Amino acid sequence: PARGTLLTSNFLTSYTRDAISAMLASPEQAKCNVRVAEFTYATIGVEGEPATASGVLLIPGGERCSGPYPLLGWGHPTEALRAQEQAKEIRDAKGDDPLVTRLASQGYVVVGSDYLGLGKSNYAYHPYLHSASEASATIDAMRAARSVLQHLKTPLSGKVMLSGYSQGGHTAMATQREIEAHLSKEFHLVASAPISGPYALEQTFLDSWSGSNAVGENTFFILLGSYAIVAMQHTYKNIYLEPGQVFQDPWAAKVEPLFPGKQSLTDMFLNDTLPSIDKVKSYFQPGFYSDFPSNPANPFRQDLARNNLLEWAPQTPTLLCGSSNDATVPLKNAQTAIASFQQRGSNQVALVDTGTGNASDNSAFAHMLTKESCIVVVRDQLLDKQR
């Protein structure tokens, strides 16, 4: 099966323009009804072998919303529940999701892949924070969606845009880099707006390795760090033979099945499935824990480095969004990225900060606030202007 081939597609539900406006009034108003669709497609694994993945497709429509519509590829945030599908989540939430209320309702066709190893994908694990497969998964999700859209005769303008939140920001940028480098004829990319993504991946882990960074405590670090470790091992198979080489017991024997597994990140954190950040020294093996921040040859550190998104020159008008209150993914990531891009001859990337400006609000939880806040900001400041 050629990459991007549409295997199955199904329409779940639809939300009226008024119902969406009602949610927004709880005053921005929707201009489009929104149809929720799901689909599965052919794509590739981290070794280029065949694999499948699932995705979500939001289609705008309405008397005050005639086409043509731009196509926006979206990268979702860290997902530890293997079976999780975005389309069904939106359906369960009855349209209560910013992708519907802020973008699709305004005329943006939204396409998002559940990523390899998640949703309906047949991949044995999820290549968490793996630039190449995050990009290939997104690219192919967009290819399959275009087939669904063509069959429906949905009017597309031809313009393509990208965005994503958290891990999704990393996904969005990784996808942008891949398109510009090889697929500019297939995808006419006119705007990219990564949100709170760890572009300076390796340095981000180094900075929060103690459990806290310049911004504040990185509360979810044990969970996000463990996911990265297990994933990078799966992807590169160069960190350890037994989890016991990296984690202390009893965590060594229970960590791999969780990323991804039968538990959502919320579940794990609320029920202390893994120790809290203040007990990090009893979690990671002392050797590994001290070696990572002081040894650039550390295999996990090397795998993170291979997934940095700094060494290139963005050509698409880009707007990195995030918050100075964010202690989960420090805005330093965007700043470092900008400096790197400018040093490589690119002036296409801008930055916007949605933080309160009050250090009193710095927090790991300020991270989730950037999702809708930034969706709105990047849409108003960049996306709308590139339609």
Which three-class secondary structure string do you get for 92-109?
A: HCCCCCHHHHHHHHHCCE
106: which 2 tokens? 């305004």
Closest C-alpha among 128, 130, 124 to residue 265: 128
Contacts 24+ apart (CB under 8 A), 182-186: 183/139
Distance (Å, rounded) from C-alpha 54 to C-alpha 238? 28
Centre a 10 Å sphere on the Cβ of residue 295 and count the other Cβ atoms it contains.
Answer: 11
Query: φ, ψ for residue 158 (rounded to 5)?
Result: 105, -20
Reduced to 3 states (helix: H, G, I; strand: E, B; else coil), residue 374 is helix
In the chain, CATH 3.40.50.1820 covers 1-200+309-387
For CA atoms 22, 28, 32, 36, the dihedral sign is negative
Contacts of 69 (CB under 8 A, 6+ apart): 60, 107, 108, 109, 154, 155, 156, 157
CATH homologous superfamily for the domain 1-200+309-387: Alpha/Beta hydrolase fold, catalytic domain (3.40.50.1820)
Number of neighbours of residue 61 by Cβ within 10 angstroms: 18
End-to-end CA distance of the chain: 33
Cα–Cα distances (Å) from 191 to 12, 77, 237, in that order, read 29, 20, 35
Strands 318-322 and 156-165: unpaired
Strands 156-165 and 188-195 come out as parallel
Interrupted after residues, the chain (C–N over 2.5 Å) = 26
91 with 15: CB under 8 angstroms?
no
Would you list the DSSP string of 255-309? SGGGTTBSS-HHHHHHTTSS--GGGGGGTB-HHHHHHHHH-TT-HHHHHHHTT--
Q: How far apart are CA 195 and CA 77, in angstroms?
A: 10
Q: Which of 365, 372, 277 has its CA nearest to residue 326?
A: 365
What is the token pair recorded at 129?
């924070």
Task: Give yes or no for a contact between 152 and 59, defined as CB atoms under 8 angstroms apart.
Answer: yes
3-state secondary structure of 31: coil
**Can you give the three-state secondary structure of 40-68, one letter per residue?**
EEEEECCCCCEEEEEEEEEEEECCCCCCC
Report how far residue 341's alpha carbon sits from residue 384's, in angstroms, rounded to the nearest whole number. Answer: 24
b (16+ CB within 10 A) / e for 210-234: ebbbebbbbbbbbbbbbbbbbbbbb
- CA dist 248 and 241 (Å) reads 14
Distance CA 187, CA 183 (A): 6
Asked if 23 contacts 96 with a C-beta cutoff of 8 angstroms, the reply is yes
Q: Which positions ≥6 away from 350 have C-beta within 8 Å?
A: 318, 319, 320, 338, 382
Are 234 and 116 contacting, i.e. CB atoms less than 8 angstroms apart? no
Alpha-carbon gap, residue 202 to 206, rounded angstroms:
6
Measured between alpha carbons, how far is 291 from 283 in angstroms, rounded to an integer?
15
Q: Which DSSP string do the residues of 153-176 spell out, in sequence order?
A: T--EEEEEEEEEETHHHHHHHHHH
**Structure tokens of 286?**
């002392």
Alpha-carbon gap, residue 229 to 127, rounded angstroms = 10
| Closest residue by Cα to residue 189 from 317, 348, 351 | 317
What are the Cα distances from residue 295, in Å, to 200, 281, 289, 290, 291? 17, 18, 11, 9, 5
Exposed, middle or buried: residue 97 (CB in 10 Å: 0-12, 13-18, 19+)? buried
Cβ-contact 4, 139 below 8 angstroms? yes
Alpha-carbon distance of 199 to 195, in angstroms, equals 10
Experimental method: X-ray
Are 361 and 299 within 8 A, CB to CB?
A: no
| Order of all β-strands in the sheet with 318-322 | 6-15, 33-44, 50-61, 109-113, 69-75, 156-165, 188-195, 318-322, 349-353
CA distance linking residue 261 with residue 282, whole number of Å? 23
Please, which residues have CB within 8 angstroms of residue 184's CB and are 6 or more apart in sequence? none
Helix (H) or strand (E) holding 371: helix 366-378
